[PDB]
Design brief:
With 568 residues, the protein is mainly alpha-helical. It has 28 helices and no strands. Bound molecules: ligand 6AK. InterPro entries: ALB/AFP/VDB, Serum_albumin-like, Serum_albumin/AFP/Afamin, Serum_albumin_CS, Serum_albumin_N.
């Protein structure tokens, strides 16, 4: 009894409120900030009457009830909102799942005004905690699935930016680098976790659990299977409740798990020493991103247990999933150089066939030839990878981006230009990210990175679906989406996208934007021109892509009255 009380005491009050504010920002993305602040604190003082003691009349109820009522205080007015009030006409029965079902991944939130440095430092110094509450509210509301205890981590680092950069010498030169590193870092976190949650609620718990044993196994090659199984259990717990919106129990369970690891390193890894001296948010972040422990040296071949034996079909018949996770454990520990996804379908094949030959004429005889159908699976990325990286070094991140923009708009023209240019820009960022690395590192690095960018495409398209091929690749099976998409070709059913004038004109506003901003606009234009002209597309493209760059460059420095743009 007394849910709030329990978690309030384990999390402490600062990030109890921080968590609860995030929760509200992610459940009702279009509620102004002051209202959210009002709700968070009424929640909080209610919470400390309930810490005062259980028998608080209303203490004993569920977090889902309490948060629900506090948002169905206001979330009932429809003219300002939408079908949101309807979730308040319902009850905890389906009201909460109504709320989750209404989260939006590309909400239409107004821009984020960026004051100059002195403005921001003064507002920070006036009331710094209003400031940081602001920061949580805006990021959470645009990333309704952002992994929360990590967001406390970023909040910490962001306010450290303001505290030290506002007493330095040059506050700009200090701050803006830090903010842009922190912004890029933050978009990575959001996307990663957006893949986890998609895995969970579109593919069930055991898909994610497989993903977890694969990835912890590559990471902790020296732990016995019991240990890894335990951690995959508990971290599954954690992401189930961070994706289910149970943010206070997601966080508390994440702290608990960090406590446990930093208590059993000897039986876990050897690269935890450093991470197990940091404060308690950094702890989880670091632990989450620690490097791969070295693999143990003389590890038995796997044919011993998984091929040569014939207690394979009966060891399997008793506990199927424990035996497969055993397999994918051993395979995965033995291959830090395999992407998680590859190993997962290696276990999927190993299964599909154990399901077949544990019944066939002679199991061992027919299932003996299994590690042969691994080799195709294992080649197909490595080659695609080495092809794509040689292309990237041949063109640099930007022109790389432009190539894949033509590529993928021609596979999937129906999809909105914004999502095309976005998803592709990040695809381009794979190149700088991974091709630096040895050809062990490259394919875990790479293929696991394309799983998340492609899922980003998937959920952006899932909210306004227009291309059937996107849907089929995003739903068949999550482990084969990168191959699926790669396998795609030009869609010829399509027809020229008419021809509009104000699509292909640039406007004078652009001289005031940042170099990155200007690039994003000219690839917006480039996907507009493929949609309008999928026909003549070899050098003609690069030709007029370069022409648009040259054209704006000339007219921005035109000293004119904008007109150079208007006439060509
Ligand atoms: C985890 C994470 C951390 C993070 O960390 C960096 C924070 C991102 C961020 C920025 N700004 C924010 C404001 C904000 C507003 C509105 N008004 N005021 C006064 C403030 C302080 C709030 Cl309330 C909350 C967050 C931000 C300033 C506006 C846009 N922008 C900016 C954006 C750009 C640009 O993108 O072009 C250039 C910018 C600034 C700020 C200065 N320069 C040069 C930022 O860098 C960012 C992200 C996405 C993530 Cl996912």
């Amino acid at each position: 009894k007394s849910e709030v009380a329990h978690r309030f005491k384990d999390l402490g009050e600062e990030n109890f409120k921080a968590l609860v504010l995030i929760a509200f920002a992610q459940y009702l993305q279009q509620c102004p900030f002051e209202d959210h602040v009002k709700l968070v604190n009424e929640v909080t003082e209610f919470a400390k009457t309930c810490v005062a003691d259980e028998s608080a009349e209303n203490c004993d109820k569920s977090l889902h009830t309490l948060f629900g009522d506090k948002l169905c205080t206001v979330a009932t007015l429809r003219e300002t909102y939408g079908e949101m009030a309807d979730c308040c006409a319902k009850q905890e029965p389906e009201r909460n799942e109504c709320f989750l079902q209404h989260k939006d991944d590309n909400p239409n939130l107004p821009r984020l005004v960026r004051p100059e440095v002195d403005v921001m430092c003064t507002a920070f110094h006036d009331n710094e905690e209003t400031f940081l509450k602001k920061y949580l509210y805006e990021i959470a509301r645009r990333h309704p699935y952002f992994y929360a205890p990590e967001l406390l981590f970023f909040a910490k680092r962001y306010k450290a930016a303001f505290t030290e950069c506002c007493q330095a010498a040059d506050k700009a030169a200090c701050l803006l680098p830090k903010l842009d590193e922190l912004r890029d870092e933050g978009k990575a976190s959001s996307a990663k976790q957006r893949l986890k949650c998609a895995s969970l609620q579109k593919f069930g718990e055991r898909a994610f659990k497989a993903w977890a044993v694969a990835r912890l196994s590559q990471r902790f090659p020296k732990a016995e299977f019991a240990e890894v199984s335990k951690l995959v259990t508990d971290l599954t717990k954690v992401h189930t409740e961070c994706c289910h919106g149970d943010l206070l129990e997601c966080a508390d369970d994440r702290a608990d798990l960090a406590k446990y690891i930093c208590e059993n390193q000897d039986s876990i890894s050897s690269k935890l020493k450093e991470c197990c001296e940091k404060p308690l948010l950094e702890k989880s972040h670091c632990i989450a991103e620690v490097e791969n422990d070295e693999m143990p040296a003389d590890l038995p071949s796997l044919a011993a247990d998984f091929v040569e034996s014939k207690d394979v079909c009966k060891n399997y018949a008793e506990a199927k999933d424990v035996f497969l996770g055993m397999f994918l454990y051993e395979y995965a520990r033995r291959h830090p150089d395999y992407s998680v996804v590859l190993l997962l379908r290696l276990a999927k094949t190993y299964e599909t066939t154990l399901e077949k030959c544990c019944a066939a004429a002679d199991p061992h005889e027919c299932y003996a030839k299994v590690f042969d159908e691994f080799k195709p699976l294992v080649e197909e990325p490595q080659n695609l990878i080495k092809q794509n990286c040689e292309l990237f070094e041949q063109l640099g991140e930007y022109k790389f981006q432009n190539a894949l923009l033509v590529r993928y708009t021609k596979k999937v023209p129906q999809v909105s230009t914004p999502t095309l240019v976005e998803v592709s820009r990040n695809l381009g960022k794979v190149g700088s990210k991974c091709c630096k690395h040895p050809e062990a590192k490259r394919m875990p690095c790479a293929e696991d990175y394309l799983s998340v960018v492609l899922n980003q495409l998937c959920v952006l398209h899932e909210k306004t679906p227009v291309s059937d091929r996107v849907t089929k690749c995003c739903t068949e099976s999550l482990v084969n989406r990168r191959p699926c998409f790669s396998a795609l070709e030009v869609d010829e059913t399509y027809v020229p996208k008419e021809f509009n004038a104000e699509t292909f004109t640039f406007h004078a506003d652009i001289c005031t934007l940042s170099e990155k901003e200007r690039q994003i606009k000219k690839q917006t234009a480039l996907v507009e021109l493929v949609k309008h002209k999928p026909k003549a597309t070899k050098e003609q493209l690069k030709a007029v892509m370069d022409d648009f760059a040259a054209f704006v460059e000339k007219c921005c420095k035109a000293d004119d009255k904008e007109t150079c743009f208007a006439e060509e």
